[PDB]
């Protein structure tokens, strides 16, 4: 863990979560809206470096 | 035998719990899934110590499932039976083949061939019991047993007990 | 590069996951923690009361058994049958009730230097003579003299409650 | 449903069966399945290395199994027996050794038993050894002159040789032995890291390309602040 | 009974690793393999014709003196000497009393070995130990 395509997977990953009755903090349209407002609570672990979707 | 063991577990959370309080659900899942479970590698995981200090590492979202996998490290008291160990328990069931002795969360089965020749099965007494000139073994009778063998499955443990050796049997 | 000793309590061959030397979550080497029935009973109940306290924030055998049963139901979830049997078994088979009695027992037996498994048996099984202990616990053979074991057993019965 | 943990294949360690393992793996209707009463994967029961075998025989002495290489025609008795190694040639499905005199050279056939004994005497140690399973349904005692036994062995060897988007994820989206293709991999106990696209495609797991070149974790630091 | 187990007839030539042990109860030679097979599970009758004494597994021990009779005398003497412990000083220099005391102890050991008065001798031995 180093001290401190992605869009497609994040949108699909959160779209599946929303379809499974996950809480919405703002299914593909909802995920896109969350990404626009930076409300997707996931971190991309680039292979490693962890990068928050918000930042 | 009772032990304190440092264990790890892979809990999975449905996306419905991806809220600001998902850590609380992980503690509930850890208690509701581990406590009372019989892991043959570690024995009967009985209780979880330091319930406010469980380590919850960053979760990983599965590709297609959509759930998040969490690696959880916790401290729990685990009961692991070993062959050649001496235990005490209360008989719960009696039958022609043998009787079962309850030791903690485990049951120990004593077959006819593992009992002294003096003891003889008798169904005349209600409930059925094993009678011998010196004493009678039946349900609720305290018995000291020696585990002669254990078959630890993935999620199940069974043992066979013996009372033929000296200083064993009824207390 | 990995491919294919049966466990035996008498030979102190407890397997792979219960070796004498253990590694905790902090990476520090530690001695295997084996608990006698009295010690195990205290550990389980002490954790339960602490867990109950956290939830709220956010004696004769019969009364203690009932008190344990009510506490167990309140502070445990589903599939708790195994723990219910354990607490009932522990309360009806322990030898030391109070923490002070357990503490003295640990201090007494820690000077023997035996394996953690053997000391747990000594505090869990009641014996009258060193011969009974030796046959019930084969691992004690050729490790402790009969005179040393005889005094330990007599002292252990001295601190036994009631 | 299975209680065992669900994992992903991270490595494929090719090797070779030992005779002990084949007997140990074998379960024998035993191949509803009578063995598991099931979902059943298939239970096992109980020619491509001829060039490799010939090379090994030439590279080592055929009496003591000590390393000599092919051109060498003497044990160089260092520990050794001093026998002159033969010239091995492949005829059909058999190996023939020829010794040159000190006047046609002496010729004989190296029996498979002799080759096996020498190989066992040769000094991967775990997964593939020079000395080294009926597929499941889904996939000399008396008389017997040498001529009869040889014919039967040849027939058996010949027979053996002859025998040998439906999800929201996809909706939104829209060098290893296995990668090259295997006998050589097993002989050398080749370890396949399954880091290539071909290996993951074969094993049906997400490849580390495009959307799979990273891992999507879940962060609790942001979750608490989102309410 | 020369170099093999009377029960399983295992010769030393075929199994050189074989060893023998004797239980102080009836001083009957038996190989360790038979001991593990029979007495490991629990106490059982000695496997000799005409012998029915119950002997435990733990009590088995190696034989030191080749003569079996001498082994019995020493072990009995060991038991007696544990109960009977005295020195010349204990009698305050009375050599005659010390010599008489030693003679009585030897008589007790001899009686135990031959079992002439085992019942009375054992009772007397128990009384002194308690006292
Ligand atoms: Zn099957
Ligand atoms: Zn050679
Ligand atoms: Zn024998
Ligand atoms: Zn005998």
Curated annotation (Swiss-Prot), chain A:
An example molecular function term from Gene Ontology annotations: DNA binding
Keyword annotations from UniProtKB, A to Z: Cytoplasm, DNA-directed RNA polymerase, Nucleus, Phosphoprotein, Ribosome biogenesis, Transcription
Subcellular location: Cytoplasm; Nucleus
Cellular component aspect of the GO annotation: cytoplasm; nucleoplasm; nucleus; RNA polymerase I complex; RNA polymerase II, core complex; RNA polymerase III complex
Record GO biological process: nucleolar large rRNA transcription by RNA polymerase I; ribosome biogenesis; RNA-templated transcription; termination of RNA polymerase I transcription; termination of RNA polymerase III transcription; transcription by RNA polymerase I; transcription by RNA polymerase II; transcription by RNA polymerase III
Keyword Transmembrane among record annotations: no
UniProt entry tagged with the keyword Protein transport: no
Organism superkingdom: Eukaryota
Region of interest (Leucine-zipper), ranges: 27-42
Subunit structure: Component of the RNA polymerase I (Pol I), RNA polymerase II (Pol II) and RNA polymerase III (Pol III) complexes. Component of the RNA polymerase I (Pol I) complex consisting of 14 subunits: RPA135, RPA190, RPC40, RPA14, RPB5, RPO26, RPA43, RPB8, RPA12, RPB10, RPC19, RPC10, RPA49 and RPA34. The complex is composed of a horseshoe-shaped core containing ten subunits (RPA135, RPA190, RPB5, RPO26, RPB8, RPB10, RPC10, RPA12, RPC19 and RPC40) where RPA135 and RPA190 form the DNA-binding cleft.
Family classification: Belongs to the archaeal Rpo6/eukaryotic RPB6 RNA polymerase subunit family.
Other facts: Present with 6090 molecules/cell in log phase SD medium.
Taxonomic classification: Eukaryota, Fungi, Dikarya, Ascomycota, Saccharomycotina
Curated annotation (Swiss-Prot), chain B:
Protein location: Nucleus; Cytoplasm; Cytoplasm, P-body
InterPro entries: NA-bd_OB-fold, RNA_pol_Rpb7-like_N_sf, Rpb7-like, Rpb7-like_N, S1_domain
Any one biological process term the GO annotation gives: transcription elongation by RNA polymerase II
GO cellular component, one term: P-body
Keywords: Cytoplasm, DNA-directed RNA polymerase, Nucleus, Transcription
Function of the molecule: DNA-dependent RNA polymerase catalyzes the transcription of DNA into RNA using the four ribonucleoside triphosphates as substrates. Component of RNA polymerase II which synthesizes mRNA precursors and many functional non-coding RNAs. Pol II is the central component of the basal RNA polymerase II transcription machinery. It is composed of mobile elements that move relative to each other. RPB7 is part of a subcomplex with RPB4 that binds to a pocket formed by RPB1, RPB2 and RPB6 at the base of the clamp element.
UniProt subunit comment: Component of the RNA polymerase II (Pol II) complex consisting of 12 subunits. RPB4 and RPB7 form a subcomplex that protrudes from the 10-subunit Pol II core complex. The RPB4-RPB7 subcomplex probably associates with TFG1. Interacts with NRD1 and PAT1.
Name of the protein: DNA-directed RNA polymerase II subunit RPB7
Organism, scientific name: Saccharomyces cerevisiae (strain ATCC 204508 / S288c)
Curated annotation (Swiss-Prot), chain C:
GO cellular component assignments: cytoplasm; nucleus; P-body; RNA polymerase II, core complex; RPB4-RPB7 complex
InterPro entries found in the cross-reference section: HRDC-like_sf (IPR010997), RNA_pol_Rpb4/RPC9_core (IPR006590), Rpb4-like (IPR045222), Rpb4/RPC9 (IPR005574), Rpb4/RPC9_sf (IPR038324)
Residues that span the membrane, as ranges: none
Coiled coil is among the record's keywords: no
BP terms from Gene Ontology: DNA-templated transcription initiation; mRNA processing; nuclear-transcribed mRNA catabolic process, deadenylation-dependent decay; positive regulation of translational initiation; RNA-templated transcription; transcription by RNA polymerase II; transcription elongation by RNA polymerase II; transcription initiation at RNA polymerase II promoter
MF-aspect GO terms: nucleotide binding; translation initiation factor binding
Keywords noted in UniProt: Acetylation, Cytoplasm, DNA-directed RNA polymerase, mRNA processing, Nucleus, Phosphoprotein, Transcription
Localization annotation: Nucleus; Cytoplasm; Cytoplasm, P-body
SMART domains in the record: RPOL4c
Main location: nucleus
Superkingdom of the organism of origin: Eukaryota
Protein family according to the UniProt entry: Belongs to the eukaryotic RPB4 RNA polymerase subunit family.
Protein name as annotated: DNA-directed RNA polymerase II subunit RPB4
From Swiss-Prot, chain D:
Residues where Zn(2+) 2 binds: 61, 64, 75, 81
UniProt-annotated location(s): Nucleus
Processing and modification events after translation: The tandem 7 residues repeats in the C-terminal domain (CTD) can be highly phosphorylated. The phosphorylation activates Pol II. Phosphorylation occurs mainly at residues 'Ser-2' and 'Ser-5' of the heptapeptide repeat. The phosphorylated form of Pol II appears to carry, on average, one phosphate per repeat. The phosphorylation state is believed to result from the balanced action of site-specific CTD kinases and phosphatases, and a 'CTD code' that specifies the position of Pol II within the transcription cycle has been proposed.
Top-rank taxon: Eukaryota
Binding residues for Zn(2+) 1: 33, 36, 40, 43
Note: Mutagenesis experiments demonstrate that the minimum viable CTD contains eight consensus Y-S-P-T-S-P-[A-S-N-G] heptapeptide repeats. Identical and simultaneous substitutions in a number of consecutive repeats are lethal: 'Ser-2' -> 'Ala-2' (14 repeats), 'Ser-5' -> 'Ala-5' (15 repeats), '2-Ser-Pro-Thr-Ser-5'-> '2-Ala-Pro-Thr-Ala-5' (10 repeats), 'Ser-2'-> 'Glu-2' (15 repeats), 'Ser-5' -> 'Glu-5' (12 repeats), '2-Ser-Pro-3' -> '2-Pro-Ser-3' (15 repeats) and 'Tyr-1' -> 'Phe-1' (12 repeats).
Recorded domain comment: The C-terminal domain (CTD) serves as a platform for assembly of factors that regulate transcription initiation, elongation, termination and mRNA processing.
